[PDB]
Amino acid sequence: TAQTVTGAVAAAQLGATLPHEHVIFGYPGYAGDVTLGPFDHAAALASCTETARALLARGIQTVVDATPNDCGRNPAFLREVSEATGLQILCATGFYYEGEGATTYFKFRASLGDAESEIYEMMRTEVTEGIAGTGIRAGVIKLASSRDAITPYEQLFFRAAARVQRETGVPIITHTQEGQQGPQQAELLTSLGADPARIMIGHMDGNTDPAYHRETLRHGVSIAFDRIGLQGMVGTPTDAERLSVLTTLLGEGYADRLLLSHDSIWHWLGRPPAIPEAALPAVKDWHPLHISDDILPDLRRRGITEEQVGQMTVGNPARLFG
Ligand SMILES: C[As](C)(=O)[O-]
Ligand SMILES: [Co+2]
Ligand SMILES: [Co+2]
Ligand SMILES: [Mg+2]
Ligand SMILES: [Mg+2]
Ligand SMILES: [Mg+2]
Ligand SMILES: [Mg+2]
Ligand SMILES: [Mg+2]
Ligand SMILES: [Mg+2]
Ligand SMILES: [Mg+2]
């Protein structure tokens, strides 16, 4: 059974799922801008609950919140949103990648002792017991790596997660930076004994060469085109490019291993971002209703079957997280 912020749910009750989104999110440092960028709890709850209701209207029953521990993760808030709407939400345990995470703390611990073991204890505790003493458990482990390599800092997390995976069976979802390291992540995790059927390599839509995806898929892991809607936003390709690669893969029979999400942020922590003019088109379709309203219908018109769409949105999530 999957562990959600309101308790365990049977694989069968997960339904259509968005495997990677962010109810709330803040880049590391946002907490230091608390005076002019405070969290308006009432406003966030209202906004997030309306977004949640809109997903329910689309038949989406579950969302996997992939927010790292150092990026504004708030299991208690996720629980309020879930209790107020009925939307099921899984939260994560893990730290962001070296280039953008709050890395000083664990680099410090690592200099004094066994950081891998401490990260392992944190992950195991949050998965099996609860987070911050709330009784709310993490339903997934979030791992993330840099573009040019899975750094030594990042590896600490990959190794701790592999062990927690082996001991608990918990799912693992990841972040790949700028369309690279997908194969390395799959290889590393599987060589450490992690169950390939419970691993989702993320941001794979970030690379538009299908050879890169097939190689990653050779490891038996699943891969997610989880930033659908974010187009040409520094690196990120266009949705047209994503769909081209996605239909090529579906035609090669990979439906059992493909997942789809937006990586949307429902409410920002810190001061809300003001998107400049030149960037409006890049974020226009970057919201959690995009796949349901635009992408799936477009796949169907391209020849993709209802069975294939259901495999990606309901089948795979049930197997991976349930
Ligand atoms: C890579 As992220 C925490 O902005 O989704
Ligand atoms: Co990410
Ligand atoms: Co994300
Ligand atoms: Mg800090
Ligand atoms: Mg295993
Ligand atoms: Mg299994
Ligand atoms: Mg359309
Ligand atoms: Mg059209
Ligand atoms: Mg078309
Ligand atoms: Mg058909």
From TrEMBL:
Record keywords: Hydrolase, Metal-binding, Zinc
Keyword Zinc: yes
Presence of the UniProt keyword Metal-binding in the record: yes
N6-carboxylysine PTM sites in chain numbering: K142
Cofactor details (free text): Binds 2 divalent metal cations per subunit.
Annotated positions binding Zn(2+) 1: H20, H22, K142, D263
GO molecular function: lactonohydrolase activity; zinc ion binding
Cofactor(s), names only, from the UniProt record: a divalent metal cation
PANTHER family found in the cross-reference section: PHOSPHOTRIESTERASE-RELATED, PHOSPHOTRIESTERASE-RELATED PROTEIN
Protein name: Phosphotriesterase, putative
Organism of derivation: Deinococcus radiodurans (strain ATCC 13939 / DSM 20539 / JCM 16871 / CCUG 27074 / LMG 4051 / NBRC 15346 / NCIMB 9279 / VKM B-1422 / R1)
